[PDB]
Design a protein around this ligand. Sequence first.
Ligand SMILES: COc1ccc(CCc2nc3cc(-c4c(C)noc4C)ccc3n2CCN2CCOCC2)cc1
Length: 115
Amino acid sequence: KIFKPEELRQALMPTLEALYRQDPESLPFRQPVDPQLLGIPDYFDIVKNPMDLSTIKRKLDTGQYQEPWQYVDDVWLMFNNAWLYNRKTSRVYKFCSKLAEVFEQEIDPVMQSLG
Ligand SMILES: COc1ccc(CCc2nc3cc(-c4c(C)noc4C)ccc3n2CCN2CCOCC2)cc1
């Protein structure tokens, strides 16, 4: 099936909006991890493919996703990066886990309607 950028954006943006609605949970995910301001030079060594809410939002806005599982994969890459890098006791780790809860709840009827 041919997935038009405008179609994917209309159907998938509400699932990302749900993630953005999460306070305090989305706050560290709204913008790309800055290893310079954070003082974590080992970040890009561990995280080969950084992902965040603004990058996923930009990819939807710019027609970078050709098919819906690519969007789902980037949302999971964002979750997997935070769980990989951060300690189990951190805010970011517990916050990531809450975003995973929300995403799972939102994405299912959406993926069921697209194919
Ligand atoms: C609300 O939750 C927090 C969590 C941590 C901190 C300490 C600073 C901080 N520690 C961060 C770690 C990460 C991050 C992700 C996500 N994955 O690996 C690392 C590493 C990302 C951003 C981070 N930041 C800035 C967060 N601010 C929030 C206000 O809006 C602008 C962004 C402050 C607030």
